Design a protein around this ligand. Structure first.
Ligand SMILES: C[C@H]1CNc2nc(N)[nH]c(=O)c2N1
Ligand SMILES: C[C@H]1CNc2nc(N)[nH]c(=O)c2N1
Ligand code: NA
Ligand code: NA
Lengths: 305, 305
């Protein structure tokens, strides 16, 4: 299958994201310094294990080289001080783009103030995320940092149907759309994430991704890890049961044309990359019947066999 | 996915198979007494550890109870003598339907002849398979046994592309095709398996399944285990990498609306059921979007969380 809209393919410091099914490999987004991450000893001051963090980043680079799946790092923090330090470390110790991420918007806003309108921030930092409850001070922070790419979290607990994402992105009635809000902040590139409520509802998330790509052509993706980790019935079963269940959840959106996955903690990268690459390879092989051309030779189909 | 044709749903000795995506859970088909199966001490005579075989069958029943995925046993043999004994064992030690499977048509036919005319065989034995090399002797043996369900296997190296596999199924030119052959044998229920040439082309396998369900409405599925076990680069990585890659392969057809998977050796059931059930749960959550109703309460969506 193909989408009618011309697909936007962004190039974020060399990472290509978007396209028609099978054109580009899935972009994989692994979390670091998340709540409970054992490499963080003090999440307020940002005391973390530099060697362990570097080893995760090097592992990510190695797996990416092996499969062809590009990576963007999801950098989480619980305080301005911590997130600032984490970002400084990531800037120095990988080349990847990264999500500036926090549960608390004020942590993201304060970290942007510290980082400043640095050209490297413009090129590599992706704001996670412009969401339903965005504030004007947030948009001001984004603009003052000169950011160009954001995740648009097109999710509303009051708007669970896929088609509603037209409404969240474009606006409806007196509500500014999330795309319009992002554009007011100077964002030019929109990674659309419809949100995941729980494992089962990943199918609605994926349907939303399909509506977005079909009608607007923005890259579409999602973050099913939190749902998977809340699935104690599976996680407690150990290896390889947790990993194959996780693989089924994380690959599902890709099978319906999604472009990127936030797969949770980076420690799971070794199995996530192997599963996702498999799915990507099968999808691109289908291109041979559809006439879609691979956009890069650095693709799982050409690498993993 | 919702398919164009009215779907055929079969009830094979209590196993429902077929339908629109999300109607019924995936049917899982595990192999026993395959070449190299270590519980078999003599594959020519069909001598095996009956307790170990029963333990596999009991595990299958337990997993099926856990997830709601029904099971059919893939009973393999390399000799008439062996396959006859295996069938007799399966008849007595489970209530499940089963595939009468051999790579050798002479073995299938000989075994089938040994089993006579038996209503229990007619209800539970699924012929694996009507394939490109069928003979009139074979069709007549099937008719004598009074079988009503067969796997219709479009695996052919002269039919690589999906449409070529559909030509093998429906007939073309001077060939009646496999469905027509099966009907001459008195088969009334068709489990269509387009074959798996290799891992990447599982997407072509799946496209063939899609065309089958689109045009004919027969249940569709496939058997990707051999392709996965021959994937040396990924198998060499060990656990859990091999299993997650396997899970990506085995779940892919289900994500595109397929009805059953022959998942390989029964010893892999514990991880296969967990992956497949996950995919099934997500698909059934889509039911409201597609206009589909669950056909049973015994579905992963209602059991695995
Ligand atoms: C748990 C929340 C946190 N932040 C998120 N960010 C993205 N991008 N996607 C999500 O689903 C979520 N979910
Ligand atoms: C090698 C063949 C043997 N028999 C089969 N039976 C089914 N059902 N599916 C297959 O792929 C195959 N492959
Ligand atoms: Na892709
Ligand atoms: Na095959």
């Amino acid at each position: 299958f193909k989408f009618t809209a011309q697909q936007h393919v962004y190039d974020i410091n060399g990472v290509k994201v978007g396209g028609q099914p099978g054109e580009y490999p899935t972009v994989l987004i692994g979390s670091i310094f998340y709540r409970g991450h054992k490499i963080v000893s003090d999440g307020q001051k940002g005391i973390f294990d530099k060697d362990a963090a570097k080893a995760l980043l090097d592992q990510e680079a190695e797996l990416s080289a092996e499969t062809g799946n590009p990576f963007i790092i999801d950098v989480l923090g619980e305080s301005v001080e911590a997130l600032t330090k984490y970002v400084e470390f990531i800037l120095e110790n990988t080349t990847a783009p990264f999500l500036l991420d926090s549960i608390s918007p004020d942590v993201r806003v304060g970290a942007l103030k510290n980082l400043g309108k640095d050209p490297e921030i413009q090129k590599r930092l992706i704001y996670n995320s412009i969401e339903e409850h965005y504030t004007e001070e947030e948009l001001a922070a984004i603009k003052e940092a000169g950011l160009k790419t954001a995740v648009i979290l097109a999710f509303s607990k009051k708007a669970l149907k896929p088609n509603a994402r037209i409404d969240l992105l474009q606006g409806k009635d007196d509500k500014e759309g999330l795309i319009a809000a992002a554009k007011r902040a100077g964002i030019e590139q929109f990674l659309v994430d419809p949100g995941v409520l729980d494992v089962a509802s990943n199918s609605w998330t994926t349907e939303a991704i399909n509506v977005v790509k079909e009608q607007f052509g923005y890259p579409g993706g999602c973050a099913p890890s939190n749902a998977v980790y809340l699935w104690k019935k599976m996680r407690s079963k150990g290896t390889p049961f947790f990993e194959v269940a996780g693989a089924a959840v994380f690959t599902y959106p890709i099978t319906q044309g999604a472009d990127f996955i936030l797969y949770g903690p980076m420690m799971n990268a070794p199995w996530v990359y192997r599963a996702i690459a498999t799915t990507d390879a099968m999808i691109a092989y289908n291109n041979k019947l559809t006439g879609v051309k691979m956009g890069t030779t650095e693709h799982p189909l050409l690498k993993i066999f």
